[PDB]
Design a protein around this nucleic acid. Structure first.
Lengths: 64, 271, 114, 139, 37
RNA sequence: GGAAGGGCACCACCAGGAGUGGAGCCUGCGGCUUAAUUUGACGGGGAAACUCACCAGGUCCAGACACAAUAAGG
RNA sequence: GGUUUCAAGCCGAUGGAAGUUUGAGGCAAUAACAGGUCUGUGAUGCCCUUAGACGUUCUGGGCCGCACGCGCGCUACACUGACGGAGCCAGCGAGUCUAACCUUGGCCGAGAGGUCUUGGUAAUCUUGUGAAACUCCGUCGUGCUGGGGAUAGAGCAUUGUAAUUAUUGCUCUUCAACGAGGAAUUCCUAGUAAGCGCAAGUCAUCAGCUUGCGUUGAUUACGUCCCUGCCCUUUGUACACACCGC
């Protein structure tokens, strides 16, 4: 449930593109109660995206 | 920055005409495609920040009280003010008072004004500006009064003060000097040229610093009742202030005046 | 003293004689009846009292029945009363007679404003 | 017929898991069938609760008792479609020996035609057991 | 407790008939309390 | 069109009456707190059990048919 | 009898139980409701098909917690009043079966209450519901008082399996803010307001919850659109989108 609780600032996007924001984890198993745009069916994906900063990698000569 | 700037642009797309149609909010923003403008207006309407008036052959967009204060928050993002919003202490008539906090973490007071289409907003704006200028006049004259931070077009953000009203204050030790204070302060009001007719128990706010040094002050919030001395009925207004002080100090503090209190004819040789 | 009675004289009393020294609430509680399962719980309680070393504290027994009158049979046991979430272990004193078990276990966190 | 469906569930477990094939036939045909038809008949939406469904589920452990007691006079008393779906899920979920399933199919194919009987025959054809040739000839 | 159609919302719990105010005005023309004044 | 004119109302005003907001407390909402203070904007939502829709736990019962093994000395 | 093209009609007065449409509410046809489900049917679309509890339980805490804000109510700030006696005035309801309802009466207890019965499935008994406010006579003597009753202590009883964060009732004691109340706010024209209690549903126990009933019974309008709005219209109009400085 702390996964739902401490991550509240990160917005909810549905896989159908519908935005939303969490209220809380309705269950202690991280089953959560959320408010969305519209009447979703049970088939879409409630999702978040988190980003790691990537960095370039070195190079070397190659004599055949 | 950018979305707040375009929301400021459609804020500036309000001081052009009356109830604004759809393509003016398309073009005053000057954005790229149908996407940004239409999905922004839908985000406004679903959060009740805008409303649709469809008067025959004519779409139009009706701004309610909701989708303004963000811009004021943006206006207060400019002026170093509040970051966190909401704690209800007092729902008044011409304002709703909230306890808020800045980025710095000090709690402040957010009086939103709700006094539609232009006139509710604009009269809340005139009320906030008028009260801010009256607060400026009181602090410029030197009256002990809360210090104003800003007047975000129609929402006044000011300081919080540790005080409690006099109805729950039994007494103090220096009662006759408190009577001389609450006589001489109405004398100072008449020397300002004004009379605050609602000089009641709920008005006067006392901050309490210590019990040894006795370095404290007062807070007087009577803004839609201050009346200039030139008006028709200021005599018994002044006398109601004086006599409410005296009847409270007789009823609560059990104090009768040994010096005679000032009259209006006494204070006519003042300012 | 519970009614001006010495402690060890109180200790060997039955439940019904303690009802004979009880207030009206305890008397009318016991006069209507009691469940069969706290009898086996008291047998477990006295077995854990028989699992006590000399000159020390007995085995703590955890309890849910918060509405039970502390009868002088249970004086001296270390009892973990359940508050709805957790168990709190208190030694039963002769100062605790006539009370419910629910009176000795706080069921919620305090509310801090100022 | 004035019990609760929990009580009918527990009494069906008791009186099928202990009583014999003819005795639980009489139990289900007298006590479960009339309470069954009065729960569904006297209601305005003509459906059934979940614990009578569990009772009819637990009544199939002796299959002689189940088919000779529950299913066979019910279709002759008027079977509707909620009884079909509920007792067909009963007939599907519990593993039944093939002989009494075969006698049940031989019963249900002979009946006056009804889509409830079609649901029950459809459930008995979801088994694909080792049927005797008389049950195949009834098909 | 609604013992007819599981309709606890607005029971009329008086006299044990126990019909919700939605379905009570469905079955209002079966008992006899009808509109006079 | 931000022209003016009528209704016609004690959810408007005048004649008033009882008042609320003043004290204490009951009770509904918001806020805070929590492990939960279940959830709506009176919800027949009167209230220890139930109702309970919320927490701390402890548990049953799942899953049909097909299909490879496994057999009545098990 | 005024008023009205002296027309459909309005107003003042008389007779009338009733003379403002004697007053209120239900009823259609036409033109809006995705308004709220049916535990609906359809090789319907689609995440899994179940180790999920969605189903079940069983305990104990909650839903009541508190610097505060928004609001409605109860009780007061007393002498047109509190206490102590006496008189004892209604009406709407409501009541038990294959159960424990309404209870009369008699004894015990300071009471709470308890005991023993009896009547009533009801215009019959509870019931004449001998309610409260009210009437009279004494105590008080304006003094946060003999107004207030918040808070707290002690025990005793009742319903409930379980009364602890006390369900509630009874006895004694502890006697707080509160000296007619601000900015502002609500409702209202005759048995209406206001004061009062009672009965019925919430009712296992209690109301400060809702509804009907009856007792006592004012002031003052019977005018207005001046505020608050709500409409109804009349039409000056779209600059039919113009210039700019920006």
């Amino acid at each position: 449930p702390e996964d739902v609780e401490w991550f509240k600032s990160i917005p909810l996007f549905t896989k159908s593109g519908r935005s939303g924001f969490i209220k809380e984890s309705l269950g202690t198993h991280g089953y959560f109660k959320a408010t969305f745009d519209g009447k979703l069916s049970a088939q879409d994906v409630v999702a978040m995206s988190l980003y790691k900063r990537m960095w370039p990698m070195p190079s070397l000569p190659w004599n055949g | 920055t950018d979305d707040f700037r375009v929301l400021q642009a459609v804020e500036q797309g309000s001081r052009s005409h009356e109830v604004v149609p759809t393509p003016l909010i398309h073009q005053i923003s000057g954005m790229r495609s149908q996407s940004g403008t239409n999905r922004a207006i839908s985000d406004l309407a679903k959060l009740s920040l805008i409303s649709k008036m469809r008067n025959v052959k004519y779409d139009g967009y009706r701004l309610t009280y909701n989708g303004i204060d963000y811009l004021a928050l943006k206006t207060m993002l400019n002026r170093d003010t509040v970051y966190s919003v909401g704690n209800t202490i007092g729902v008044g008539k011409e304002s709703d008072i909230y306890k808020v906090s800045d980025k710095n973490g000090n709690p402040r007071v957010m009086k939103i004004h709700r006094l539609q289409g232009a006139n509710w907003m604009h009269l809340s704006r005139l009320a906030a500006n008028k009260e801010y200028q009256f607060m400026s006049m009181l602090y410029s004259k030197g009256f002990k009064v809360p210090e104003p931070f800003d007047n975000s077009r129609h929402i006044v953000v000011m300081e919080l003060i540790e005080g409690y009203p006099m109805r729950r204050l039994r007494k103090h030790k220096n009662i006759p000097k408190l009577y001389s204070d609450l006589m001489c302060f109405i004398v100072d009001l008449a020397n300002s040229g004004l009379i605050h007719c609602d000089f009641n128990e709920f008005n006067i706010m006392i901050k309490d610093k210590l019990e040894d040094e006795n370095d404290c002050g007062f807070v007087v919030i009577d803004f839609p009742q201050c009346i200039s001395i030139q008006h028709q009925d200021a005599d018994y207004y002044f006398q109601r202030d004086v006599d409410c002080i005296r009847r409270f100090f007789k009823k609560k503090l059990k104090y009768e005046p040994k010096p005679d209190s000032s009259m209006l004819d006494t204070e006519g040789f003042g300012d | 003293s519970y009614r001006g009675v010495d402690l060890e004289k109180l200790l060997e009393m039955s439940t019904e004689d303690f009802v004979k020294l009880a207030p009206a609430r305890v008397r009318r509680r016991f006069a209507r009846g009691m469940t069969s399962k706290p009898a086996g719980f008291m047998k477990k309680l006295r077995a854990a009292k028989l699992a006590a070393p000399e000159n020390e504290k007995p085995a703590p027994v955890r309890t849910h029945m918060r509405n039970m009158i502390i009868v002088p049979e249970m004086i001296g046991s270390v009892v973990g009363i359940y508050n709805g979430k957790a168990f709190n272990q208190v030694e039963i004193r002769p100062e605790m007679l006539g009370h419910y078990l629910g009176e000795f276990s706080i069921t919620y966190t305090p509310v801090r404003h100022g | 017929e004035e019990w609760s469906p929990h009580v009918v569930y527990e009494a069906t477990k008791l009186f099928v898991s202990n009583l014999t094939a003819k005795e639980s036939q009489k139990f289900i045909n007298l006590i479960l069938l009339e309470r069954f038809r009065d729960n569904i008949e006297t209601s305005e939406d003509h459906s059934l609760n979940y614990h009578i469904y569990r009772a009819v589920k637990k009544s199939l452990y002796k299959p002689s008792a189940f088919f000779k007691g529950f299913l066979f006079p019910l279709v002759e008393t008027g079977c509707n479609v909620r009884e079909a779906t509920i007792a067909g899920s009963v007939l599907a979920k519990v593993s039944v020996p093939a002989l009494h399933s075969s006698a049940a199919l031989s019963y249900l194919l002979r009946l006056p035609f009804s889509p409830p009987t079609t649901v029950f025959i459809k459930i008995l054809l979801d088994k694909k057991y080792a049927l005797p040739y008389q049950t195949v000839d009834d098909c | 407790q609604c013992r007819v159609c599981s309709s606890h919302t607005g029971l009329i719990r008086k006299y044990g008939l126990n019909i919700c105010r939605q379905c009570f005005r469905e079955k209002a023309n079966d008992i006899g309390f009808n509109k006079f004044r």
